[PDB]
Amino acid sequence: TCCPSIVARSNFNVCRLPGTPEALCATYTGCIIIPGATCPGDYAN
């Protein structure tokens, strides 16, 4: 997963702590799900 604003990630790692799919947090946090290709150059955080 790759998130822009650091804070957005902090929540993505916290929302995923429990039983939540990256999709449920990626939206509440603002991160994206990628099967590979590492992260972009403006959303790496």
Side-chain angles (χ1 to χ4, degrees):
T1 294
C2 310
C3 228
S5 162
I6 289 120
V7 163
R9 203 232 252 231
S10 140
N11 291 265
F12 173 54
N13 253 255
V14 127
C15 173
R16 177 76 254 289
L17 222 114
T20 337
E22 285 202 341
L24 229 123
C25 307
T27 312
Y28 211 116
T29 71
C31 311
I32 53 139
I33 301 138
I34 52 148
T38 193
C39 293
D42 273 78
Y43 240 56
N45 247 129

Coordinates of all heavy atoms in Angstrom, one line a residue:
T1 N 0.9 -1.2 0.0 CA 0.0 0.0 0.0 C 0.9 1.3 0.0 O 2.0 1.3 0.5 CB -0.8 -0.1 1.3 OG1 -1.7 -1.2 1.2 CG2 -1.6 1.2 1.5
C2 N 0.4 2.3 -0.6 CA 1.2 3.6 -0.6 C 0.3 4.8 -0.3 O -0.7 5.0 -0.9 CB 1.7 3.7 -2.1 SG 2.5 2.2 -2.6
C3 N 0.7 5.5 0.7 CA -0.2 6.7 1.1 C 0.7 8.0 1.1 O 1.8 8.0 1.3 CB -0.6 6.4 2.6 SG -2.4 6.7 2.7
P4 N 0.0 9.1 0.7 CA 0.6 10.4 0.6 C 0.9 11.0 2.0 O 1.9 10.7 2.6 CB -0.4 11.2 -0.1 CG -1.7 10.6 0.2 CD -1.5 9.1 0.4
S5 N 0.0 11.8 2.5 CA 0.2 12.4 3.8 C 0.6 11.3 4.9 O -0.1 10.4 5.1 CB -1.2 13.0 4.2 OG -1.2 13.2 5.6
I6 N 1.7 11.5 5.5 CA 2.1 10.5 6.5 C 1.0 10.2 7.5 O 0.6 9.0 7.6 CB 3.2 11.2 7.3 CG1 4.5 11.3 6.4 CG2 3.6 10.4 8.5 CD1 4.8 12.8 6.2
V7 N 0.4 11.1 8.1 CA -0.8 10.9 9.0 C -1.7 9.8 8.3 O -2.2 8.9 8.9 CB -1.5 12.2 9.2 CG1 -2.9 12.0 9.7 CG2 -0.7 13.0 10.2
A8 N -2.1 10.0 7.1 CA -3.0 9.1 6.4 C -2.5 7.7 6.6 O -3.2 6.7 6.9 CB -2.9 9.5 4.9
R9 N -1.2 7.4 6.5 CA -0.6 6.1 6.7 C -0.8 5.7 8.1 O -1.2 4.6 8.4 CB 0.8 6.2 6.3 CG 1.3 4.8 5.9 CD 2.6 4.5 6.6 NE 3.7 4.6 5.6 CZ 4.6 3.6 5.5 NH1 5.6 3.5 6.3 NH2 4.4 2.7 4.6
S10 N -0.4 6.5 9.0 CA -0.5 6.2 10.5 C -1.8 5.5 10.8 O -1.9 4.6 11.5 CB -0.3 7.5 11.2 OG -1.2 7.5 12.3
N11 N -2.9 6.1 10.2 CA -4.2 5.5 10.4 C -4.4 4.2 9.6 O -5.0 3.2 10.1 CB -5.2 6.5 9.9 CG -5.2 7.7 10.9 OD1 -5.9 7.9 11.8 ND2 -4.3 8.7 10.7
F12 N -3.8 4.1 8.5 CA -3.9 2.9 7.6 C -3.2 1.7 8.4 O -3.7 0.6 8.3 CB -3.2 3.2 6.3 CG -3.1 2.0 5.5 CD1 -4.2 1.2 5.2 CD2 -1.8 1.5 5.0 CE1 -4.1 0.1 4.4 CE2 -1.7 0.4 4.3 CZ -2.8 -0.4 3.9
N13 N -2.2 2.0 9.1 CA -1.5 0.9 9.8 C -2.3 0.6 11.1 O -2.2 -0.5 11.6 CB -0.1 1.4 10.2 CG 0.9 0.8 9.3 OD1 1.7 -0.1 9.7 ND2 1.0 1.1 8.0
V14 N -3.0 1.6 11.6 CA -3.8 1.4 12.9 C -5.1 0.7 12.5 O -5.6 -0.2 13.2 CB -3.9 2.8 13.4 CG1 -5.4 3.1 13.7 CG2 -3.1 2.9 14.7
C15 N -5.7 1.2 11.4 CA -7.0 0.6 11.0 C -6.8 -0.9 10.6 O -7.7 -1.7 10.6 CB -7.5 1.4 9.9 SG -9.0 0.7 9.2
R16 N -5.6 -1.2 10.1 CA -5.3 -2.6 9.7 C -4.9 -3.4 10.9 O -4.8 -4.7 10.8 CB -4.2 -2.4 8.7 CG -3.8 -3.8 8.2 CD -4.8 -4.4 7.2 NE -5.6 -5.4 8.0 CZ -5.0 -6.5 8.3 NH1 -4.8 -7.5 7.3 NH2 -4.5 -6.8 9.5
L17 N -4.6 -2.8 12.0 CA -4.2 -3.6 13.2 C -5.2 -4.6 13.5 O -4.9 -5.8 13.8 CB -4.1 -2.5 14.3 CG -2.8 -2.8 15.1 CD1 -1.8 -1.7 14.9 CD2 -3.2 -2.9 16.6
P18 N -6.5 -4.2 13.6 CA -7.6 -5.1 13.9 C -7.9 -6.0 12.7 O -7.1 -6.2 11.8 CB -8.7 -4.2 14.3 CG -8.4 -2.9 13.6 CD -6.9 -2.9 13.3
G19 N -9.1 -6.5 12.6 CA -9.5 -7.3 11.5 C -10.2 -6.5 10.4 O -11.4 -6.5 10.2
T20 N -9.4 -5.7 9.7 CA -10.0 -4.8 8.7 C -9.2 -4.9 7.4 O -7.9 -4.9 7.4 CB -9.8 -3.4 9.2 OG1 -9.7 -3.4 10.6 CG2 -11.1 -2.5 8.8
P21 N -9.9 -5.0 6.3 CA -9.2 -5.2 5.0 C -8.6 -3.8 4.5 O -9.2 -2.8 4.7 CB -10.4 -5.6 4.0 CG -11.6 -5.1 4.7 CD -11.3 -5.1 6.2
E22 N -7.4 -3.9 3.9 CA -6.8 -2.6 3.5 C -7.8 -1.7 2.7 O -7.7 -0.5 2.8 CB -5.7 -3.1 2.5 CG -4.5 -3.7 3.3 CD -3.3 -3.6 2.4 OE1 -3.4 -3.5 1.2 OE2 -2.2 -3.7 3.0
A23 N -8.8 -2.3 2.1 CA -9.8 -1.5 1.4 C -10.6 -0.7 2.3 O -10.9 0.5 2.1 CB -10.7 -2.5 0.7
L24 N -11.0 -1.2 3.5 CA -11.7 -0.4 4.5 C -10.9 0.7 5.0 O -11.4 1.8 5.3 CB -12.1 -1.4 5.6 CG -13.6 -1.3 5.9 CD1 -14.2 -2.7 5.7 CD2 -13.8 -0.9 7.3
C25 N -9.6 0.5 5.2 CA -8.7 1.5 5.8 C -8.2 2.4 4.7 O -8.2 3.6 4.8 CB -7.6 0.8 6.5 SG -8.3 -0.5 7.6
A26 N -7.7 1.8 3.6 CA -7.2 2.6 2.5 C -8.2 3.8 2.2 O -7.8 4.9 1.9 CB -7.1 1.7 1.3
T27 N -9.4 3.6 2.3 CA -10.4 4.7 2.1 C -10.5 5.6 3.3 O -10.4 6.8 3.1 CB -11.8 3.9 1.9 OG1 -11.6 2.9 1.0 CG2 -12.8 4.9 1.3
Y28 N -10.7 5.1 4.4 CA -10.7 5.9 5.7 C -9.4 6.6 5.9 O -9.3 7.7 6.4 CB -11.0 4.9 6.8 CG -11.8 5.6 7.9 CD1 -13.1 5.2 8.2 CD2 -11.3 6.7 8.6 CE1 -13.9 5.8 9.2 CE2 -12.0 7.4 9.6 CZ -13.3 6.9 9.8 OH -14.1 7.6 10.8
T29 N -8.3 6.1 5.4 CA -7.0 6.7 5.5 C -6.6 7.5 4.3 O -6.3 8.7 4.3 CB -6.0 5.6 5.7 OG1 -5.8 4.9 4.5 CG2 -6.5 4.6 6.8
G30 N -6.7 6.9 3.1 CA -6.4 7.6 1.9 C -5.2 6.9 1.2 O -4.5 7.5 0.4
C31 N -5.0 5.7 1.5 CA -3.9 4.9 0.8 C -4.5 4.1 -0.4 O -5.7 3.9 -0.5 CB -3.4 4.0 1.9 SG -3.1 4.9 3.4
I32 N -3.6 3.6 -1.2 CA -4.1 2.8 -2.4 C -3.5 1.4 -2.3 O -2.5 1.1 -1.7 CB -3.5 3.5 -3.6 CG1 -2.0 3.7 -3.4 CG2 -4.2 4.9 -3.7 CD1 -1.3 3.5 -4.8
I33 N -4.1 0.4 -2.9 CA -3.6 -1.0 -2.9 C -3.0 -1.4 -4.2 O -3.6 -1.2 -5.3 CB -4.9 -1.9 -2.6 CG1 -5.5 -1.5 -1.3 CG2 -4.4 -3.3 -2.6 CD1 -7.0 -1.4 -1.5
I34 N -1.7 -1.8 -4.2 CA -1.1 -2.2 -5.5 C -0.5 -3.6 -5.4 O 0.1 -3.9 -4.4 CB 0.1 -1.1 -5.6 CG1 0.9 -1.1 -4.3 CG2 -0.6 0.2 -5.9 CD1 2.3 -0.7 -4.7
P35 N -0.6 -4.3 -6.4 CA -0.1 -5.7 -6.4 C 1.4 -5.7 -6.6 O 2.0 -6.8 -6.4 CB -0.8 -6.3 -7.7 CG -1.1 -5.2 -8.6 CD -1.3 -4.0 -7.7
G36 N 2.0 -4.6 -6.9 CA 3.5 -4.6 -7.1 C 3.9 -3.2 -7.7 O 3.2 -2.2 -7.5
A37 N 5.0 -3.2 -8.3 CA 5.5 -1.9 -8.9 C 5.7 -0.9 -7.8 O 5.6 0.3 -8.0 CB 4.3 -1.4 -9.8
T38 N 6.1 -1.4 -6.6 CA 6.4 -0.4 -5.5 C 5.4 0.7 -5.4 O 4.3 0.7 -6.0 CB 7.8 0.1 -5.7 OG1 8.3 0.7 -4.5 CG2 7.8 1.1 -6.9
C39 N 5.7 1.8 -4.8 CA 4.8 3.0 -4.7 C 5.2 4.0 -5.8 O 6.3 3.9 -6.3 CB 5.0 3.6 -3.3 SG 4.4 2.4 -2.1
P40 N 4.3 4.9 -6.0 CA 4.6 6.0 -7.1 C 5.7 6.9 -6.6 O 6.5 6.6 -5.7 CB 3.3 6.7 -7.2 CG 2.6 6.4 -5.9 CD 3.0 5.1 -5.4
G41 N 5.8 8.1 -7.1 CA 6.9 9.0 -6.7 C 6.2 10.2 -5.9 O 6.9 11.1 -5.4
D42 N 4.9 10.2 -5.8 CA 4.3 11.3 -5.1 C 3.3 10.7 -4.0 O 2.7 11.5 -3.2 CB 3.5 12.1 -6.1 CG 4.4 13.2 -6.8 OD1 5.2 12.8 -7.6 OD2 4.2 14.3 -6.4
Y43 N 3.2 9.5 -4.0 CA 2.3 8.8 -3.0 C 3.1 7.8 -2.1 O 2.5 7.0 -1.5 CB 1.2 8.1 -3.8 CG -0.2 8.7 -3.4 CD1 -0.4 10.0 -3.6 CD2 -1.2 7.8 -3.0 CE1 -1.7 10.5 -3.3 CE2 -2.4 8.3 -2.7 CZ -2.7 9.7 -2.8 OH -3.9 10.2 -2.5
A44 N 4.4 8.0 -2.1 CA 5.2 7.0 -1.3 C 5.3 7.6 0.2 O 6.2 8.3 0.5 CB 6.6 7.0 -2.0
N45 N 4.4 7.1 1.0 CA 4.5 7.6 2.4 C 3.4 6.9 3.3 O 3.1 7.4 4.4 CB 4.3 9.1 2.4 CG 5.6 9.8 2.8 OD1 6.1 10.7 2.1 ND2 6.1 9.5 3.9

